[PDB]
């Protein structure tokens, strides 16, 4: 069977879509260790979001599947007679799933603690991580979009997928010629609004554009939305995620009967506060659960926060430099040869990252044998599964094939970069594979990747559902 499998993959890799592209393709049988396929396995290539495989593995090794993240609220001391306190601090310690509802629950605790008036100022403390918001080589033109959200120890996650450091912008048509209605979501009262958008005639062309001009905290909207067009929503990033959380907490407190007299801003506990009083706190779900939205949807913010959390745990420094060292050491301790690996970030967004298909398969093998193997493989997108939380970024791929509900793999695509690596379990043996394509000039070779995955599923003993 080996000869037929190899010839079939050989044939697939001849696709004109891979024209001028270099593709590292490696397939191994996890049970036996037999190398089923190998081409350019040692070639260093950009991994895109496949970098998250390394980050997740390191996170489970360093933080542990049972690790949880916390957020707290504290004053120098408990409220006095009139239920007053001076300055108040909202302190985040890396929770990548801190919601606005979580903030309200904490605001309620502040009230239930006996607080009625914050005579001082409200401060958002995200000193748990450093203030380096973006990776050095990330592209500035990508900054307005969710995947490029600024990194902070204190950030509000939006929706059930927990997209951090963003706000949901909504644009609703009015009558022809009238300005379009633009809502800034959570960022109302925080980010500035520059609405230049107008409502076009019914049946006209939609030319709406929602942007956040580089280096500003303004949501600029331009173009025209037809009067008969459906309302539009878009996630847009905001400058200083912690400052937004402060705004949102300010509103929460207000809604729970707690008045804030001073201003809202960034700042850490004075340290000259020996007995601070924690009026409220929140604990996130455990890492094993957080991995799901993280890996299924390829959440960049989660990845970078995990790296910095890894840095705090290994060196008391929530920094990329310390975090990336922690990741490499965690991988080596796992038995992975990191020689051909270059770590520049944990999400894979950075063009400075490098991996080799052999290194990916190596990781897949070691991780599959670790005590957290099940929680790890469960976080991976499952090919062709309609449920977003199961199919993830593979929900619309390989549906109706032998791979549907079988292939567990992480995706990763950017201009000129595409990858698919994971597992293909079956009665004919547990397979591990990695496909990394760099250099193609058109759309990512997703169909090529799919073809190979389906062929592997068939080799593993599966049949397409009829
Ligand atoms: Mg507001
Ligand atoms: Mg099957």
From Swiss-Prot:
Its EC number is 3.4.16.4. It catalyses: Preferential cleavage: (Ac)2-L-Lys-D-Ala-|-D-Ala. Also transpeptidation of peptidyl-alanyl moieties that are N-acyl substituents of D-alanine. Pfam families: Peptidase_S13. It is found in: Secreted. SUPFAM superfamilies: beta-lactamase/transpeptidase-like. Inhibited by benzylpenicillin, cephaloridine, ampicillin and cetiofur. InterPro entries: Beta-lactam/transpept-like, Peptidase_S13. Substrate binds at residue 410. Residues 97-270 are annotated as: Absent in class-A beta-lactamases. The keyword Signal applies. Pathway: Cell wall biogenesis; peptidoglycan biosynthesis. It is an enzyme of class 3 (hydrolase). GO terms for cellular component: extracellular region. The active site is at residues 49, 52, 298. It comes from the Bacteria. One of its GO terms (biological process) is regulation of cell shape. GO terms for molecular function: serine-type D-Ala-D-Ala carboxypeptidase activity. Keywords: Antibiotic resistance, Carboxypeptidase, Cell shape, Cell wall biogenesis/degradation, Hydrolase, Peptidoglycan synthesis, Protease, Secreted, Signal. NCBIfam families: PBP4. PANTHER family: D-ALANYL-D-ALANINE CARBOXYPEPTIDASE, PENICILLIN-SENSITIVE CARBOXYPEPTIDASE A. Belongs to the peptidase S13 family. Removes C-terminal D-alanyl residues from sugar-peptide cell wall precursors. This is D-alanyl-D-alanine carboxypeptidase. It comes from Actinomadura sp. (strain R39).
């Amino acid at each position: 069977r080996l000869t037929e499998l190899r010839e079939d993959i050989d044939a697939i890799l001849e696709d004109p879509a891979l024209e001028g592209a270099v593709s590292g393709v490696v397939v191994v049988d996890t049970a036996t260790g037999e190398e089923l396929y190998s081409r350019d396995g040692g070639e260093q290539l950009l991994p895109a979001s496949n970098m998250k495989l390394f980050t997740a593995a390191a996170a489970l090794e360093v933080l542990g599947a049972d690790h949880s993240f916390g957020t707290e609220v504290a004053a120098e001391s408990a409220p006095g007679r009139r239920g007053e306190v001076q300055d108040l601090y909202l302190v985040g310690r890396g929770d990548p799933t801190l919601s606005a509802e979580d903030l309200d629950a904490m605001a309620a605790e502040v009230a239930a603690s006996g607080v009625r008036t914050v005579r001082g100022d409200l401060y958002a403390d995200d000193t748990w991580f450093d203030s380096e918001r973006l990776v050095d080589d990330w592209w500035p033109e990508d900054e307005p979009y969710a995947y490029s959200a600024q990194i902070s120890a204190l950030t509000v996650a939006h929706g059930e997928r927990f997209d951090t450091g963003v706000t949901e912008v909504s644009v609703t048509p009015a009558a022809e010629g009238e300005p379009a209605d633009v809502d800034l979501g959570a960022a109302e009262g925080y980010a500035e609004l520059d609405n230049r958008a107008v409502t076009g005639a019914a049946g006209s062309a939609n030319t709406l554009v929602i942007d956040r001009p580089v280096g500003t905290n303004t949501i600029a909207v331009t173009g025209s939305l037809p009067a008969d067009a459906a309302p539009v929503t878009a996630l847009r990033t905001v400058d200083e995620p912690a400052a937004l959380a402060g705004h949102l907490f300010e509103e929460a407190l207000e809604s729970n009967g707690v008045t804030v007299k001073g201003d809202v801003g960034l700042g850490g506990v004075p340290a000259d506060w020996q007995d601070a009083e924690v009026l409220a706190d929140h604990t996130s779900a455990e890492l094993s659960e957080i991995l799901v939205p993280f890996m299924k949807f390829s959440n960049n913010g989660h990845a970078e926060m995990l790296v910095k959390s890894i840095g705090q745990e290994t060196a008391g420094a929530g920094t990329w430099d310390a975090g990336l060292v922690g990741v490499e050491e965690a991988l080596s301790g796992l038995g992975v040869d990191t020689a051909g690996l270059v770590l520049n970030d944990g999400s894979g967004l950075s063009r400075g990252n490098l991996v080799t298909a052999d290194t990916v398969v190596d990781l897949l093998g070691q991780a599959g044998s670790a005590p957290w193997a099940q929680t790890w493989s469960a976080s991976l997108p499952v090919a062709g599964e309609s449920d977003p939380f199961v199919g993830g970024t593979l929900a619309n791929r390989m549906r109706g094939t032998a791979a549907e509900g079988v292939v567990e793999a992480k995706t990763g695509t950017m201009s000129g970069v595409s990858a698919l690596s994971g597992y293909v379990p079956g009665p004919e043996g547990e397979l591990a594979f990695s496909i990394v394509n760099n250099g193609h000039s058109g759309p990512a070779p997703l169909a090529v990747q799919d073809a190979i995955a389906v062929r592997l599923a068939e080799y593993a003993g599966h049949q397409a559902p009829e």
